[PDB]
């Protein structure tokens, strides 16, 4: 699927907590879609990955103040088109939120190798 | 598009104007400043060529694009 | 820039590498210059062709001497001469290609014609 002239292709892979239940990630994936689609966006998709253990331990502090040590987590992956001037809200939300641990927004392109 | 003399000035006039608004924020982008003076210089030698060939086109082009005329 | 300044060198460098062909550019001025070297015996043959609308010429050099050359009148300093100061290179072994109002000729042909002009390059 091609892109319109007004925007290019981005992608996003996240790292979620392992202890989350089913009902939580439904509201979470729904939170980013309505947030990502509220801005200029087209052709949003959502893949899923398991609880593959992490290569190194993690420290994350919630609003309550306590910290937690993790070893496994739920990975998510997005592939979408958004405008260039509508990505910094996404990256901003992927750091303030406590359910998300890491965030890596990449811009994959065509390469002939 | 065409490659006429007045058309090259129109593209540089937008390329120059596009970079002025950028340097209002990223004033420390001195590498782009070196590129800005090129387009400012390329149009200077083209308009210098347009002048001695035909002055009518010069006064009409500078009037619509709001270009400062050079002394001497 | 000066075309003829490049013409004299493309023939010079060919003799240093000791080649036969030159593939020299064709113009209204060079065709007259080359024409003098044919009659004067400095070049064996010349020949014309084209690859685009532009044109070229192909020379044929001779097989311990060296084909000396020199330019005289440059863009930064033009040199003219009257009839009484027409040079005589090496007592006659060389020649001078100079432009008169009646086209370009050899200095000897100017000695008979009685008209000086703009010396451009000496030959020996």
């Amino acid at each position: 699927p091609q892109c319109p002239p007004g925007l290019r292709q981005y992608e996003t892979m996240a790292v979620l907590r392992p202890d989350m239940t089913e009902d939580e990630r439904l509201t979470l994936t729904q939170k980013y879609e309505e947030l990502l689609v509220a801005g200029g966006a087209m052709y949003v998709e959502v893949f899923n990955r398991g609880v593959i253990p992490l290569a190194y331990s993690i420290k994350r502090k919630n609003k309550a103040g306590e910290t937690n040590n993790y070893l496994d987590g739920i990975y998510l992956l997005f592939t979408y088109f958004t405008k260039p001037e509508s990505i910094s809200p996404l990256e901003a939300a992927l750091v303030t939120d406590d359910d998300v641990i890491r965030s890596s927004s990449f811009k994959i392109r065509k390469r002939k190798y | 598009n065409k490659g006429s003399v007045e058309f090259q000035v129109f593209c540089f006039t937008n390329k120059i104007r596009r970079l002025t608004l950028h340097l209002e924020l990223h004033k420390k982008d001195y590498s782009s400043q070196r590129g800005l003076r090129k387009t400012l210089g390329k149009r200077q030698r083209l308009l210098a060529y347009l002048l001695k060939i035909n002055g009518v086109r010069y006064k009409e082009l500078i009037s619509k694009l709001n270009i400062r005329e050079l002394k001497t | 820039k000066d075309t003829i300044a490049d013409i004299i060198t493309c023939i010079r460098n060919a003799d240093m590498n000791r080649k036969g062909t030159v593939r020299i550019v064709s113009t209204n001025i060079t065709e007259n210059i080359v024409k003098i070297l044919l009659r004067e015996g400095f070049i064996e043959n010349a020949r014309k062709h084209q690859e685009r609308n532009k044109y070229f010429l192909v020379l044929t050099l001779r097989h311990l001497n060296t084909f000396h050359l020199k330019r005289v009148s440059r863009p930064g300093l033009r040199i003219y001469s009257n009839y009484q100061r027409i040079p005589r290179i090496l007592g006659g072994m060389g020649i001078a290609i100079l432009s008169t109002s009646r086209g370009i000729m050899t200095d000897r042909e100017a000695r008979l014609e009685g008209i000086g002009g703009e010396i451009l390059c000496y030959i020996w």
């Binding site: 290569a55 890491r102 990449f106 994959i108 390469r111 190798y113 | - | -």
Partner: protein, 53 residues
């Protein structure tokens, strides 16, 4: 292909300690080698592959 989400292609160009191998032993090209660096450095931040050991 060559990217961060591919484990099999990236896992065969790392050392036992998780370091990046040289172009000579990998026998890659320039465009290829520069991406193995990026694909690994990206993945390490994601905890898909450890920084050391």
């Amino acid at each position: 292909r060559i990217d961060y989400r591919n484990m099999s292609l990236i896992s065969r160009f790392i050392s036992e300690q998780g370091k990046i191998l040289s172009r000579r032993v990998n026998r890659l090209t320039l465009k290829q080698q520069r991406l193995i660096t990026s694909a690994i450095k990206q993945a390490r931040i994601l905890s898909l592959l450890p920084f050391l050991n």
